[PDB]
């Protein structure tokens with residue numbers, strides 16, 4: 001049930017308060033949400049929108065932005081970054 005994130009993703013999780021390097025998928029998603037908060041990547045006016053371009057998260061997603069209503073690009077990134 002646990003996964004090991006690749007190094008760039010691991011750095012992101014730690015910036016969000018995570019410890020160690022083995023996580024459940026739900027932990028990864030929790031900490032990614034927390035990362036978005038701490039780095040203030042969301043639009044205060046449209047809080048469903050995240051602007052990740054120019055942040056390491058954007059580089060990993062291959063995106064400038066995404067909506068939290070549309071999780072599709074997120075789970076594809078996790079496939080390419082989480083080793084089970």
Ligand SMILES: C[C@@H](c1ccc(Cl)cc1)n1cnc(-c2ccccc2)c1-c1c(C(=O)NCCN2CCN(C3CCCCC3)CC2)[nH]c2cc(Cl)ccc12
Pocket residue numbers: 029030031032033034036037042047048068069071074075
């Ligand atoms: C349902 C869930 C979700 C979870 C996964 C996915 Cl692929 C989509 C959606 N979700 C709903 N809104 C968010 C969210 C929105 C804006 C900024 C930060 C987080 C999230 C995300 C969580 C999370 O663990 N969220 C706890 C509840 N959230 C409500 C919104 N809250 C705040 C939003 C910003 C302003 C203050 C309230 C934080 C607590 N983790 C995520 C990680 C990513 Cl890669 C993307 C989004 C989220």
